[PDB]
Enzyme design. Structure first.
Site, PDB file in Angstrom:
ATOM      1  N   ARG A   1       0.824  -1.205   0.000  1.00 30.34           N
ATOM      2  CA  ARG A   1       0.000   0.000   0.000  1.00 30.34           C
ATOM      3  C   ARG A   1       0.852   1.247   0.000  1.00 30.34           C
ATOM      4  NH1 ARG A   1      -4.576   1.203   2.214  1.00 30.34           N
ATOM      5  NH2 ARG A   1      -3.961   3.086   1.063  1.00 30.34           N
TER       6      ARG A   1
ATOM      7  N   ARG B   1       4.754   5.814 -16.023  1.00 26.89           N
ATOM      8  CA  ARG B   1       5.599   5.832 -17.211  1.00 26.89           C
ATOM      9  C   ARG B   1       6.787   6.787 -17.055  1.00 26.89           C
ATOM     10  NH1 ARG B   1       0.979   5.712 -22.057  1.00 26.89           N
ATOM     11  NH2 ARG B   1      -0.059   3.789 -21.347  1.00 26.89           N
TER      12      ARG B   1
ATOM     13  N   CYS C   1      -6.849   2.959 -12.732  1.00 25.90           N
ATOM     14  CA  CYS C   1      -7.218   3.902 -11.703  1.00 25.90           C
ATOM     15  C   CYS C   1      -8.701   3.731 -11.363  1.00 25.90           C
ATOM     16  CB  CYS C   1      -6.882   5.335 -12.141  1.00 25.90           C
ATOM     17  SG  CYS C   1      -5.145   5.544 -12.708  1.00 25.90           S
TER      18      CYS C   1
ATOM     19  N   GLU D   1     -11.888   6.793  -5.374  1.00 25.61           N
ATOM     20  CA  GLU D   1     -11.976   6.440  -3.969  1.00 25.61           C
ATOM     21  C   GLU D   1     -13.360   6.877  -3.484  1.00 25.61           C
ATOM     22  OE1 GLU D   1     -11.696   4.856  -1.311  1.00 25.61           O
ATOM     23  OE2 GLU D   1      -9.741   5.451  -0.496  1.00 25.61           O
TER      24      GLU D   1
ATOM     25  N   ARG E   1      -4.011   6.920  -3.586  1.00 25.57           N
ATOM     26  CA  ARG E   1      -3.580   5.709  -2.947  1.00 25.57           C
ATOM     27  C   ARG E   1      -3.087   4.750  -3.967  1.00 25.57           C
TER      28      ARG E   1
ATOM     29  N   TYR F   1       3.514   5.873   3.548  1.00 22.91           N
ATOM     30  CA  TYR F   1       2.572   6.977   3.671  1.00 22.91           C
ATOM     31  C   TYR F   1       3.333   8.310   3.676  1.00 22.91           C
ATOM     32  CZ  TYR F   1      -0.576   3.178   4.896  1.00 22.91           C
ATOM     33  OH  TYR F   1      -1.314   2.016   4.877  1.00 22.91           O
TER      34      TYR F   1
ATOM     35  N   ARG G   1      -1.583   6.024   8.626  1.00 20.48           N
ATOM     36  CA  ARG G   1      -0.695   4.948   9.057  1.00 20.48           C
ATOM     37  C   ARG G   1      -1.004   4.489  10.482  1.00 20.48           C
ATOM     38  NH1 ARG G   1       3.243   7.660   9.203  1.00 20.48           N
ATOM     39  NH2 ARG G   1       4.539   7.378   7.331  1.00 20.48           N
TER      40      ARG G   1
HETATM   41  O1  LIG Z   1      -6.871   2.501 -19.637  1.00 22.76           O
HETATM   42  C1  LIG Z   1      -5.745   3.042 -19.740  1.00 22.76           C
HETATM   43  O2  LIG Z   1      -4.692   2.377 -19.871  1.00 22.76           O
HETATM   44  C2  LIG Z   1      -5.622   4.547 -19.696  1.00 22.76           C
HETATM   45  C3  LIG Z   1      -4.205   4.923 -19.256  1.00 22.76           C
HETATM   46  C4  LIG Z   1      -4.012   5.056 -17.746  1.00 22.76           C
HETATM   47  C5  LIG Z   1      -2.639   5.631 -17.505  1.00 22.76           C
HETATM   48  O3  LIG Z   1      -2.492   6.872 -17.479  1.00 22.76           O
HETATM   49  O4  LIG Z   1      -1.688   4.831 -17.355  1.00 22.76           O
HETATM   50  C6  LIG Z   1      -4.117   3.732 -17.013  1.00 22.76           C
HETATM   51  C7  LIG Z   1      -5.281   3.267 -16.553  1.00 22.76           C
HETATM   52  C8  LIG Z   1      -6.596   4.008 -16.743  1.00 22.76           C
HETATM   53  O5  LIG Z   1      -7.178   4.291 -15.472  1.00 22.76           O
HETATM   54  C9  LIG Z   1      -6.432   5.336 -17.483  1.00 22.76           C
HETATM   55  C10 LIG Z   1      -5.079   5.975 -17.193  1.00 22.76           C
HETATM   56  O6  LIG Z   1      -6.643   5.191 -18.896  1.00 22.76           O
END
Ligand SMILES: O=C(O)[C@@H]1C[C@]2(C(=O)O)C=C[C@@H](O)[C@@H](C2)O1
Ligand SMILES: O=C(O)[C@@H]1C[C@]2(C(=O)O)C=C[C@@H](O)[C@@H](C2)O1
Lengths: 117, 117, 117
Positions: free
Chosen positions: A7, A63, A75, A78, A90, A108, A116
């Site tokens: 986490r 990236r 993603c 929340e 998170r 955290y 925490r």
């Molecule tokens: O489906 C995806 O791959 C894209 C790219 C993304 C990212 O920025 O890495 C990764 C996961 C997804 O929540 C969003 C953001 O859309």
């Protein structure tokens, strides 16, 4: 080998792309440091944000990490808890590891140091 | 020995911390009982709530389980689906286990029994 | 017995149960074909939708896949990102696989092709 969740939580002061990327990147870097994580050993990552953050997907910061371009990440929103930490990001990083459950280093940072145990 | 998800779902009548923790704990206890789960065999856990619940993070229930303090857990908002079950809490508990996929015991309590296979 | 996340993303033009289920099925089928995935090897799956989709849970499309009735699945709300892709459905399918991380075939269809690395 066993698989284990790691986490992380951090916060931004405002809903901007610069803040979100910078803080997410720092959060991921701290977890990698503490657990000596290699990207080949990452099953997957889930990033969440409280519903007051909209500027950018936190996963974009992943990236910014050399070698991690093939780590699968997604993603989610929340839940909005009355009295809950605002502007919060998170991470749940799922990793192949032999390290016992109680020795895993959960990270955290920023205003999330209050969550925490 | 493989890793498998275990699903649970339940509901509360009121958006109050006391009831959300009570019903979430009962759900976890039922999953634990039916699947003989030990906390060290839990990779991670995800808990979700429909967007009509705000009193507390359901993950707070996990901490009132003796021995489960090192189990990584995080929460998310369930997708808002028209005509979907309201005030619903769900769990995805990822464990290491010898039990075959078709024999895992997923658990549906209170009004969430209508989601049961 | 290493475990790996497989990512998928797609879009629909209208918020209807018919289109959500159809595009979700097509995404899953393409993932299963490219990765040679057998339902018993799936640890669990997470599906998300942007908050402009409400007609049905995308997970419903999983039971239109013969043999997939025991795969544990749950849904979550994708975070609402400003300027983010609209009407988007995503998948994180967690699988037991020996395919190396750089060879996992992630699938991006319809308007989600813009999300590819
Ligand atoms: O489906 C995806 O791959 C894209 C790219 C993304 C990212 O920025 O890495 C990764 C996961 C997804 O929540 C969003 C953001 O859309
Ligand atoms: O908890 C559940 O089991 C039910 C069923 C459901 C589906 O339609 O597949 C799967 C996952 C959940 O997000 C929703 C939709 O509620």
């Amino acid at each position: 080998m066993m698989i284990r969740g790691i986490r992380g939580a951090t916060t931004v002061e405002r809903d901007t792309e610069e803040e979100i990327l910078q803080k997410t990147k720092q959060l991921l870097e701290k977890i990698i440091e503490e657990n000596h994580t290699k990207p080949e050993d990452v099953v997957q990552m889930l990033l969440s944000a409280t519903p007051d953050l909209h500027a950018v997907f936190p996963a974009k910061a992943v990236r910014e990490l050399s070698g991690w371009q093939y780590v699968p990440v997604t993603c989610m929103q929340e839940m909005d808890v009355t009295g809950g930490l605002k502007k919060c990001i998170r991470v749940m990083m799922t990793v192949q590891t032999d390290v016992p459950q109680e020795q895993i280093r959960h990270v955290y940072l920023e205003k999330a140091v209050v969550l925490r145990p």
